[PDB]
């Protein structure tokens, strides 16, 4: 996988490494899941999420 195509499969940020290697990363206020691609909030008000809508579908 490569970060240029499909964002390397990452939900958020993607870094290419030497060889066929890729690491996904998450913004502050999120953590990376064991799938190596998904980011989940770690705080109450993570950036770029709308609380009234996140509660509406929770």
């Amino acid at each position: 996988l490569i970060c240029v195509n499909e964002n390397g499969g990452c939900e958020q940020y993607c870094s290419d490494h030497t060889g066929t290697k890729r690491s996904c990363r998450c913004h502050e206020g999120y953590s990376l899941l064991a799938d190596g691609v998904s980011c989940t909030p770690t705080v109450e008000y993570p950036c770029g999420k709308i609380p009234i809508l996140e509660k509406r579908n929770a």
Binding site: N7, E11, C39, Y45, C47, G48, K49, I50, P51, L53
Partner: protein, 250 residues
């Protein structure tokens, strides 16, 4: 905003209102609890830099509902490459005097990494632009925060489709050429926010255009991806005395 809709209260929680002596100046975008991104051109005519206020959690300018949070602007940081009276490099980074408190009505927009923004976000077709700017060209400003979904153009296509400042690599076009829908005066500095896989990111700043919703023309936005490293370095820096700071770019 021309041809948009009221942003339901709390659905644009990163939107900032900038005031100078209580009067509406410009919009902005919250990106952390003490940092706001706006447009450099908003500050060309400021006489008393100590009367600039940022308001978070605002919605309806006619009423106080208790979700608003006001802060003094302690620093206005502008790239060395910006020239007053012109359009290029139209970005400002504002430091608030005290953090805002994050709430259901006050939430930062994510400032993306450059690579992500260039390789992924730049190809998301539609993004939201918002503000309390004019509802029509030569018209009154909005009392409730407005929002509009606009599609982004490759610059070659904007120049081709448009029929005068150049569109530089520090800008991009977005919107419609049929005179129906656009950002407008008074929305300057506000967010162009882009959704990707459940999260919203800052990709542009409302900057300029030929009139508003002018047939044959598109809104022009500051291309925030060009400034990510510049913004990030400044956010790690200590404050300096005096409100206005010109900082080298790149």
């Amino acid at each position: 905003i021309v041809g948009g809709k009221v942003c339901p209260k709390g659905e644009c929680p990163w939107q900032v209102l900038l005031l100078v002596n209580g009067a509406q100046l410009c919009g902005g975008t919250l990106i952390n609890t003490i940092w706001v991104v706006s447009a450099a051109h908003c500050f060309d005519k400021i006489k008393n830099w100590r009367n600039l206020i940022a308001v978070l959690g605002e919605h309806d300018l006619s009423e106080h509902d208790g979700d608003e949070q006001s802060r003094r602007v302690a620093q206005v940081i502008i790239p060395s490459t910006y020239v007053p009276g012109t359009t290029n490099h139209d970005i400002a980074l504002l430091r608030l005097h005290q953090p805002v408190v994050l709430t259901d009505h006050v939430v930062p927009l994510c400032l993306p990494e450059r690579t992500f923004s260039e390789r992924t976000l730049a190809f998301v077709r539609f993004s939201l632009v918002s503000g309390w700017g004019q509802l029509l060209d030569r018209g009154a400003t909005a009392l409730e925060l407005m929002v509009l979904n606009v599609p982004r153009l490759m610059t070659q296509d904007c120049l081709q489709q448009s029929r005068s400042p150049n569109i530089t690599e520090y800008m991009f076009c977005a919107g419609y050429s049929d005179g129906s829908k656009d950002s407008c005066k008074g929305d300057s500095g506000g967010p162009h926010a882009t959704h990707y896989r459940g999260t919203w990111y800052l990709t542009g700043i409302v900057s300029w255009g030929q009139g508003c919703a002018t047939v044959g023309h598109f809104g022009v936005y500051t291309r925030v991806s060009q400034y990510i490293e510049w913004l990030q370095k400044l956010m790690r820096s200590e404050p300096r005395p005096g409100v206005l700071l010109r900082a080298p770019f790149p």
